[PDB]
Amino acid sequence: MREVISIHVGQGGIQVGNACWELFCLEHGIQPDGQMPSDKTIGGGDDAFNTFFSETGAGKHVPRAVFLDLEPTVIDEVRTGTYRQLFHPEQLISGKEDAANNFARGHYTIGKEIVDLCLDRIRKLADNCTGLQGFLVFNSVGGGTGSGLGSLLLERLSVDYGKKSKLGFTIYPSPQVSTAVVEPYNSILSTHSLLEHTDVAVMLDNEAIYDICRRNLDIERPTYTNLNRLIAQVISSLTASLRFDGALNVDITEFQTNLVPYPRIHFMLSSYAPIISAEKAYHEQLSVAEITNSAFEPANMMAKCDPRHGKYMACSMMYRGDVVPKDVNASIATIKTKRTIQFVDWCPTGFKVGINYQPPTVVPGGDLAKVMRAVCMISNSTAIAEVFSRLDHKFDLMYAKRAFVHWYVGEGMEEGEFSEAREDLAALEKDYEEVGIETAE
Amino acid sequence: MREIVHIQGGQCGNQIGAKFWEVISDEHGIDPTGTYHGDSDLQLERINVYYNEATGGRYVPRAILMDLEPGTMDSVRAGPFGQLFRPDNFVFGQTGAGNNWAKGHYTEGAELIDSVLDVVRKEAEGCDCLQGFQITHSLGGGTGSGMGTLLISKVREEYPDRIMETFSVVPSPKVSDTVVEPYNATLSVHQLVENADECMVIDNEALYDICFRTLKLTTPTYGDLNHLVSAAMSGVTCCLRFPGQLNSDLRKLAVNLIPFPRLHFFMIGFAPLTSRGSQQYRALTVPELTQQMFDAKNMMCAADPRHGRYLTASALFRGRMSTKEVDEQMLNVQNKNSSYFVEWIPNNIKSSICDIPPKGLKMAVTFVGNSTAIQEMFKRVAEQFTAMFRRKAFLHWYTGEGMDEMEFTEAESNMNDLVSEYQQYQDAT
Amino acid sequence: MREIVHIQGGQCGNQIGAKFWEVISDEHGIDPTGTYHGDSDLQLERINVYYNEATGGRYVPRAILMDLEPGTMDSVRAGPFGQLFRPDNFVFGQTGAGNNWAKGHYTEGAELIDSVLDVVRKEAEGCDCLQGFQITHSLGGGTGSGMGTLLISKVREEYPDRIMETFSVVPSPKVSDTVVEPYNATLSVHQLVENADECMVIDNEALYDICFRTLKLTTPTYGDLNHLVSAAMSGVTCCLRFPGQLNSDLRKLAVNLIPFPRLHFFMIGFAPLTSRGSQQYRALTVPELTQQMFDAKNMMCAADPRHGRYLTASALFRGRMSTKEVDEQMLNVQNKNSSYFVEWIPNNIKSSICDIPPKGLKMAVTFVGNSTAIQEMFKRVAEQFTAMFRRKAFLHWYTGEGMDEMEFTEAESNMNDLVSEYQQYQDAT
Ligand SMILES: [Mg+2]
């Protein structure tokens, strides 16, 4: 009735996915094998797990998500891991020789190799599904298939269904921290082929995960376990409406042309809170106002792009748990109140409340403390264009020096893809350039 | 029999009517199961004009469910009194409007209207002398308005004699629960000014103000709020439901309320409203509740009588009293603040009484007066629509529905026309 | 009672039936010793129509052993459930056919047929209302076909009313386990087109494909394969063995399967077929197994429905479900790929259900449809026969049996005639 499905790519990406399905399975508490601890009573009023966990004729409830990546080592760990009763073989599609972070390889070269298997799996699930709203696709501009092969993936999947929503979680090159140097190539080559195949998607950067887990989670020494846990929470709440009763169970498609008013600049930030320790869970109270005012801390901004340097457009503060329409509401007045913040005035307010009544659940072994209320500030501003500009300037020079270009030209891409894709970020620079212009008079 | 029906869409409104029928059940004291457990035939006398007996005495509503996604259908389907329903009416959607009103009006609007208007029509045959029906949604989106626009058009044509008393939620000036509100709203209100017979304004912030200040409550939700409003919307048919030494129906009301058909957006006042201690401060008199009646703080709408002028004013009284008081306070008040009483409408205040108040209280008051203060309401919402329509902000979600902008101009200079229209009537003597 | 018998020759087929009766024993849960250890009389209700009680409850098969060299007789004689047999039927040879089919058909063909047809005939008196009997060999040599040709002729004359449902192994186009195959084959198939009542194709390469791809198995043998086929050939009599809300016997089947008697070469599909992990990918529905039913990869024969056209198609369902689904998927599919459905056969798909699936599974599917795609099969084998018959390659092994070549012409223009025959039926409307 209300389905979504997750797709996983790139090393960090399927790392995220593993964390996620660990999470949801924890949260509905269905045991890793595929059974719930106990029988399910027959009831109505709304869906349940049925969105994602797959009903069998018995205690076998597998996700509705798919793995695809050409670097097949790690995924085997899932193939080995505790959830080897959880998942399902045909759920698993991997490539042996990954891209080597040639975008053009797993996009072009090995792009040709596994696509059809992917699409068949997609047809099996969507055919298995009925009211699948949209598509959860995860990848990374690092684990190279996460850029290339995913690029073809949406490039064709969109042309397959279209009417489904594109739920885009991919990681963005951290501003000064990194993984490689061809990242310019991965990213921008992705981007010009990303945009028109993307509906909307958010940009998760890691350095924020570090700084904030270390200060706010009080973390001393983190890694992808903590990161994947954190994105696990954020996606855990970004879709609760289709999973749990909330006052305004807003929906993705609902989000689509309302958060991203124009068609073009359709990405965003997301600073979840309240992430604190057990020793800050106590020694604190964690007000709605604390999560709320705290929600707009630029230093809390969960992607390393200063909001205060940008002007907000929309903010879908979907809330978990014991939320009051009034209290949050006045907090939103407080958000109108913030002098430092500046909004795409031709969109004076574009707010859209989310009050889901389940407060958050915590993953044992985790660092986040337990609370009563969650916020997701999926918000869109002018600010985020800048780091892009760093990307196209860095890539600008490096590409000017023809660095690495032999690698890509060797695999079947043309140079005008490069300069033209730079025209692509040129245009989007005109977009964040223009939409931020205040309409005259 | 002047019986009527209910139809609800609306992100909230679907909940609203749930509370509403809930309340009426209380005033009819029939079990959740659907049989009567009360103490006077009077609850049974006029029971039909909202309810419907069933074979075996299943007593049922004349309600119509609107929704574009079954969750609400499950929700109220999970509702106490849920066994007091008919499974037939659970007419919902598989998609949701996403509140682009064109989506809920063309896309899904045209998609699911048919099954509704059919079964509703089967209810139309179920109605002997249908006084009307009650629609409910919100005027800012599509979860209700998406289709409810089509309802008002279709049934309005299909039943050009029936009353269409329309309550839908108005976006408060301060808090924008969505930014596509000016557009859904304006596109709707173009329709509603043409097609709807009665309308009363549904703000949230007023209801907050009532709960927090005058209710002295800290914890606001919807459900209490729908209690506060279904109190009034439940009062409205009281005489029509029960005897009254001074009775007046919706036809007598609107015809006795509206000078010209474009003025069926009405504001609302209901009372008393206390917290528990208050009774041990104060007691109940007709003059007392009168002293609440003309309270801007009970003025549950974005319009200010303190700023605008009462084009019309009326009182809905349920209880047992002396009208010799009632009128006396009436005229007294019609003098006391004459200036906010429009001039050439002599005795612009008008009266009523129901022999029984609502349950639990001894006397009832209701005020659905109509000033023209709403002009700031339309002016605001039209203004925001103006700004982002300069920007075309989220036109792409919009034109993706395949409407034209010229429609936006139509509801635009339209709605401005209605505003200035109220200006001249307010500015005249 | 519509009970039936089995007769197996064949280099493999002698093993095949071993597995087969093995499987049926499981579905009757009777000990290897020959007494019942199951839990429902239902296994005993219709037990006789394959089995035979003995004095003391030795429960025995109605099987007939064909062989030209006792090794197989020892083999299955060394078989688990071997104590479930009757020593009488161990009718074998002292020579072996060497697979020159004339050897197994004249030379040893005429040598040992008599003792078989006698004892078999004693089984014929042992059968009250014999629905039929099941023969098994391969269509490329003589280890089965050598004599089985004589069987079909003799019993066919001896019992012109009985059903002859014949399964014999077809040489795959790629791998030639022997090069005398076209000749044995052609000489046989001349006979089988005339004398056999039902036939279904027995490739190996399909069974490999099933085990390796769809079974996801790396280690192929015969025994598993005969498991895969005796699964189906075991399913076929289920209704005939057990109740079914929609029952159909081999007479209802073939008469409801064949337009003209020359078309009793049928292809086969059985399912589900997973490896262990698959259930934790997927679950079972009638529509699911349907979605396997029309799978060329389950199309266990050298003919392609993707290339040919379904002259006929049928489904054998064992389980407990809702036929309201079953039919619905049926017709749905008969539309969905209408083009591979032959035209003037309206509702060329046909139905069935057995109240019980096979053991271990909850629902059963079987498909023995009949396209005409086999034309490439006969065309191939006839082609190789053509080449070396141009050469007369290994005619000397052959004419050493003292046949004529004109017989080879007879099965030759014969078999071509049957092919083109299928061409016109395929090419018609
Ligand atoms: Mg990789």
C410 marked as binding residue? no
- What number of residues does chain A have? 441
- CA distance readout (Å), A261 to A149, A258, B142, B161, C20: 29, 5, 17, 42, 68
B45 and B3 Cβ atoms separated by less than 8 Å: no
Query: How many beta-carbon contacts under 8 Å exist across A and C?
Result: 30
Interface test with A, best of C216, C275, C281, C289 (most A CBs within 10 A): C281
Whether a cis peptide bond, with omega within 30° of 0, leads into B70 is no
Structure-block tokens of residue B55: 């074979």
C96: left (phi over 0), alpha (psi -120 to 50) or beta: left
- Do the Cβ atoms of B222 and B208 come closer than 8 Å? no
C near A: at least 3 beta-carbon pairs less than 8 Å apart: yes
Q: Cα distance from A305 to chain B (closest Cα, Å)?
A: 23
Technique that determined the structure: cryo-EM
Q: Smallest CA–CA separation between A4 and chain B, in Å?
A: 13
Angle between helices C109-125 and C145-158 (to 10 degrees): 40
Query: Helices A11-27 and A73-80, interaxial angle, to 10°?
Result: 20
Q: What is the distance in A from the centroid of ligand 1 to the CA of A74? A: 9
Calculate how close chain A gets to C358, using CA atoms only, in Å: 18
Please enumerate in sequence order all residues whose Cβ is within 8 A of that of C336, keeping only pairs 6 or more positions apart, or say none: none
Measured from the Cβ of residue A243, the count of other Cβ atoms closer than 10 Å reads 24
Rounded-to-integer distance, Cα A284 and Cα A242, Å: 31
Q: Do chains C and B touch (3 or more CB pairs under 8 A)?
A: no
Closest CA in chain C for residue A65: C281
Residue corresponding to tokens 């439901």: B241
Cβ(C365)–Cβ(C317) under 8 Å?
yes
Task: Show the DSSP H helices in B236-302 as ranges.
Answer: 238-241, 250-255, 286-293
- Given A1, A348, A439, which is nearest B384 (Cβ)? A348
C-alpha separations of A58 from A35, A40, A224, B115, B322 in Å:
8, 11, 34, 36, 70
CA of A126 to the centre of ligand 1 (A): 25
How much distance in Å is there from the Cα of B164 to the middle of ligand 1? 62
Q: How far is C304 from chain A (nearest CA, A)?
A: 21
Q: A95: CA distance to ligand 1 center in Å? A: 8
How far is it, in rounded angstroms, from Cα C7 to Cα C66?
Answer: 7
Sign of CA dihedral A328, A329, A334, A336: positive
Catalytic residues of A: 254
- A145 labeled part of a ligand binding site: yes
Beta bridge partners of A54: A62
Nearest-angstrom CA–CA distance, B62 and A423: 61
Q: How many CB pairs under 8 A join A and B?
A: 125
The edge-to-edge listing of strands for the beta sheet with B163-169 is B63-65, B4-8, B132-138, B163-169, B198-202, B265-266
- Which residues in chain A are closer than 8 Å to C281, comparing Cβ atoms? 62, 88-91
Residues of B with CB under 8 A from a CB of A: 11, 69-71, 73-75, 77-78, 94-96, 98-100, 174-180, 204, 208, 211-212, 219-222, 384, 387-388, 390-398, 400
What interhelical angle do A415-434 and A385-400 show, nearest 10?
150
Shortest alpha-carbon distance between residue C320 and chain A (Å)? 13
> Is C280 within 8 Å of A55 when comparing Cβ atoms?
no
Residue among C223, C193, C194, C196 at smallest CA distance from C211: C223
Distance of alpha carbon C73 from alpha carbon C65, whole angstroms: 8
Q: With an 8 Å Cβ cutoff, are A46 and B99 in contact?
A: no
Give the A-side interface with C, CB within 8 Å.
Answer: 34, 54-57, 60, 62, 85-91
C-beta separation of B300 from B167 below 8 A:
no
| Resolution in units of Å | 5.7
Say whether A346 and B78 touch across the interface (CB within 8 A).
Answer: no
Beta bridge partners of A137: A7, A168
* Chain-chain contact of B220 with A44 (C-beta, under 8 angstroms): no
Which chains are within 8 Å of A by 3+ CB pairs? B, C
Give the helix, strand, coil percentages of chain A, each rounded to 5.
Answer: 45, 15, 40
Q: For residues B209 and A50, what is the distance between their CA atoms, to the nearest angstrom?
A: 40
Q: Which residue of A has its CA nearest to C285?
A: A57
* A179 known member of a binding site: yes
Alpha carbons C65 and C345: distance in angstroms, whole number: 40
Ligand 1 being an ion, which residues bring their Cβ within 5 A of it?
A: A 69-71, 98, 143, 145
Q: What residues of A are in contact with residue C280 (Cβ under 8 Å)?
A: 34, 60, 62, 85-89
| Residue C283: closest C-alpha in chain A | A56
Binding residues of B for Mg(2+): 69
Q: Which residues of chain C have a CB within 8 Å of the CB of A86?
A: 280
Per the listing, tokens 């459930």 go with C81
CA C269 – CA C364 distance, rounded (Å): 11
Per the structure block, which two tokens stand in for A117? 């298997």
The 10 Å CB-count burial string (b at 16+, else e) for B297-308 is ebbbbbbebeeb
Q: How far is the CA of A165 from the centre of ligand 1 (A)?
A: 25
Query: In this structure, are residues C136 and C144 in contact, taking their beta carbons and an 8 Å threshold?
Result: yes
Cβ contact, residue pair A90, C284, below 8 Å: no
Instruction: Tell me which chain B residue has its CA closest to the CA of residue A45.
Output: B74
CB B238 within 8 A of CB B316: yes
Distance from CA of A261 to the nearest CA of B (A): 3
Peptide bond into B173 cis (omega under 30): no
